[PDB]
């Protein structure tokens, strides 16, 4: 994080935009190392609807490698660059890491329900279609539909391009900014 060595290399952002990103990063966390609760507040503030504590928690646990307890600027900017202006094939590795909570690269139908309920708690209590108590597990099964029936990272990676919705969703923010 010297300001020039982190050019488009290893952080797909120009130095002029890197200056703005670092300035916005430091203005809210001047210490240079973002804590978990700071991330929770800075993520849930843009939504005046239901809480975002758990989803931001998993986001930080993915961000926080080696269990430092707080993320510095280099890993933050690297992950942000990969997530925003990354490679179509390469991006979904960190997506699987987001959906991989049990450390080892395996899914036993339980690392994804909690993520879905955390996401769906965002809608508050004035939602146009009422979130029935079975709707979270219903959409969990809906996501299971595309997941491998036989007993994963490889199947998800090789089936993501089968569904054009995901691929056309990457270009929503891949090109913008």
């Amino acid at each position: 994080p010297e300001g020039l060595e982190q050019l488009e290399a290893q952080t797909n952002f120009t130095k002029r935009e890197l200056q703005v990103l670092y300035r916005g990063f430091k203005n809210e966390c001047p210490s240079g190392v973002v804590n978990e609760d700071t991330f929770k507040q800075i993520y849930a503030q843009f939504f005046p609807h239901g809480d975002a504590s758990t989803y931001a928690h998993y986001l930080f646990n993915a961000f926080d490698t080696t269990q430092t307890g707080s993320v510095k600027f280099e890993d933050f900017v690297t992950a942000l660059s990969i997530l925003l202006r990354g490679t179509v094939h390469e991006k979904l590795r960190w997506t699987f890491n987001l959906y991989d909570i049990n450390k080892d690269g395996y899914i036993n139908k339980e690392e994804m329900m909690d993520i879905v309920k955390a996401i769906y708690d965002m809608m508050g209590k004035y939602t146009y279609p009422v979130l029935k108590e079975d709707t979270p597990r219903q959409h969990v099964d809906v996501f299971f539909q595309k997941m491998d029936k036989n007993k994963t990272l490889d199947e998800f990676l090789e089936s993501c391009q089968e569904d054009d919705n995901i691929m056309r969703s990457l270009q929503l923010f891949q090109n913008v900014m």
């Binding site: 990063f25 925003l84 913008v176």
Partner: protein
């Protein structure tokens, strides 16, 4: 909050968290502009010296006078700056608050 606009693109990356679950028409970003950052250090000279600030830094609270085009009432066209005729030290605290 409206004052953390510099972290708004990061929330874009948050879509990748729920993107595989996402499925819909995705009406796409609404005609975004200035892909590369063009943040102008706009100058505000208040009865003497000047104070420079980023446009988003002054516009993160549009509900106040310095937001929107209201500030342009005090804009000085022949000098390309904002010559406010207020006290130049309380404005310092206002700038610190805006930041």
């Amino acid at each position: 909050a409206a004052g953390v606009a510099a972290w708004l693109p990061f929330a874009r990356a948050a879509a990748i968290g729920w993107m595989p679950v996402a499925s819909g028409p995705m009406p796409a970003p609404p005609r975004q502009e200035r892909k590369r950052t063009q943040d102008a250090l706009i100058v505000l000279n208040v009865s003497g010296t000047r104070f420079q600030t980023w446009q988003d830094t002054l516009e993160r609270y549009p509900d106040t006078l310095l937001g929107s085009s209201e500030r342009d009432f005090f804009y000085h066209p022949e000098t390309q700056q904002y010559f406010f005729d207020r006290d130049p030290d309380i404005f310092r605290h206002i700038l610190n608050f805006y930041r």
